[PDB]
């Protein structure tokens, strides 16, 4: 849950010369004492119980436990990190918003990529390197390059079919059907030579894609709201 | 172990009271003090927390601007301050020992009575 | 904020017949500890709120066998097997799993004639 963590580190006193038949270790009080306590600015202090231990199978062991219980305060990394990562992420879709003839699909496409796996790496960096669980912020930054990928791929496709003409290809009639009648009514479209018609064949195809990436991109906050 | 609430109090719109619960017979610094409503009517609401070791508080969004948290470390009192009182302000209002995650609500306050009115 | 409701809002039973509370959450107040932190107070007339149980079902030091609790999810019990004069009351509910945590409706015990 970083950078909306809260953390249970533990403090563990044994005396290294005498076992529980020598001395036993005793609690004065069940909590540890913040009378004279200096806040911390980055994390808060939630409980800091103590709990006397003993083993019931060794009968030599005696120890005293203090639970730090800390909750980290989020504004400096949301401002820093959260903000940016959905900032860059606001921008996979754009790719699908952006006319074939302004040459600058891949250079959208390929700079979100960019952005959101230097993200990641910096995320990777701040977080220790343990493979017990993964961030929530790490797994979305994650979902997010597999849908910039496959946007990469789906614009490369939408870009091939914007630069067809009658002297090289031929439009099936299964196209001129599902990409010029039938899908575009579905997309409140509308079309108003050949040429200019596999232009408007592309136009369509990365519509429906900006309709999906925007219902996955919208439902893509139940993998982001669940955090805080 | 035993927490003490001020007396009760009556004051008119638009004041403002300023309640204390002192606690004695523990770490006061190391436990959080519930601040909690309770309007005559019924329900017990729960106006925040703080903590007197440290600055920390927490405010239930219902309350967020009407109460504020003050706390004594060398007298061991925390005090709650209820700004532009009202009608719907007037309750008994408690005060209770909290550690989260840990030793719940065991001990409250006697409970202090606050009636707004001219 | 998790709201938490309490059902029935009143609840008349005679001496000595069993009586059961129930209360419902919002969301699920699970912790990864393997607890869930939900509380039960009763609060007597002209009286502050005393502690009954704590994490469902352990019982406050102090408080007769017969009130038990029990529950999961967002499902949670008390059970009070005899009843008497001083059970009566309003039994709150409360969780302390997710910040800010909040009371129950409540539940006005009575006794019917």
């Known amino acids: 849950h970083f950078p909306f963590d809260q953390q249970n580190c533990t403090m563990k006193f044994r005396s290294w010369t005498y076992d529980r038949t020598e001395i036993d270790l005793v609690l004065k009080s069940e909590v540890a004492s913040l009378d004279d306590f200096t806040p911390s600015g980055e994390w808060d202090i939630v409980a800091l119980p103590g709990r006397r231990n003993e083993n019931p199978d060794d009968s030599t062991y005696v120890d005293i436990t203090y639970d730090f219980i800390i909750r980290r305060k989020p504004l400096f990394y949301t401002i820093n990190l959260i903000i940016p990562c959905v900032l860059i992420t606001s921008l996979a879709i754009l790719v699908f918003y952006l006319p074939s003839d302004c040459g600058e699909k891949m250079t959208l496409c390929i700079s979100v990529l960019l952005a959101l796996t230097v993200f990641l790496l910096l995320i990777s960096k701040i977080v220790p390197p343990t493979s017990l669980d993964v961030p929530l912020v790490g797994k979305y930054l994650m979902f997010t390059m597999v849908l910039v990928t496959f946007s990469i791929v789906t614009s490369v496709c939408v870009l091939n079919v914007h630069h067809r003409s009658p002297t090289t290809h031929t439009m099936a009639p299964w196209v001129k059907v599902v990409f010029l009648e039938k899908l575009p009514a579905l997309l409140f479209m509308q079309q108003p030579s050949v040429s200019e018609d596999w232009k408007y064949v592309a136009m369509v195809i990365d519509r429906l894609f900006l309709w999906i990436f925007v219902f996955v991109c919208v439902f893509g906050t139940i993998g982001m709201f669940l955090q805080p | 172990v035993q927490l003490q609430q001020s007396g009760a109090e009556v004051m008119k719109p638009g004041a403002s009271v300023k309640i204390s619960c002192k606690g004695t017979?523990?770490?006061?610094?190391?436990?959080?003090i519930e601040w909690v409503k309770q309007r005559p009517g019924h329900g017990l609401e729960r106006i925040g927390e703080?903590?007197?070791?440290?600055?920390?508080?927490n405010y239930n969004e219902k309350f967020r601007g009407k109460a504020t948290f003050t706390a004594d470390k060398s007298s061991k009192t925390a005090y709650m301050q209820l700004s532009s009182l009202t009608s719907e302000d007037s309750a008994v209002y408690y005060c209770?020992?909290?550690?989260?995650?840990?030793?719940?609500?065991?001990?409250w306050g006697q409970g202090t009575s606050v009636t707004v009115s001219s | 904020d998790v709201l938490m409701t309490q059902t029935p809002l009143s609840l008349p039973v005679s001496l000595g017949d069993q009586a059961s509370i129930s209360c419902r959450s919002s969301?699920?107040?699970?912790?990864?500890?393997?607890?869930?932190?939900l509380e039960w107070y009763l609060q007597k007339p002209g009286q502050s709120p005393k502690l009954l149980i704590y994490?469902?079902?352990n019982r406050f030091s102090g408080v007769p066998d017969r009130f038990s609790g029990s529950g999961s999810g967002t499902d949670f019990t008390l059970k009070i097997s005899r009843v008497e004069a001083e059970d009566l009351g309003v039994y709150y509910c409360?969780?302390?799993?997710?910040?800010?945590?909040?009371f129950g409706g409540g539940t006005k015990l009575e006794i019917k004639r």
């Open positions: 209770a020992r909290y550690l989260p995650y840990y030793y719940a609500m065991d001990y």
């Open positions: 017979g523990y770490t006061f610094s190391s436990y959080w």
């Open positions: 703080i903590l007197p070791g440290s600055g920390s508080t």
């Open positions: 969301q699920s107040i699970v912790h990864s500890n393997g607890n869930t932190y």
């Open positions: 994490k469902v079902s």
């Open positions: 409360f969780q302390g799993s997710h910040v800010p945590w909040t």
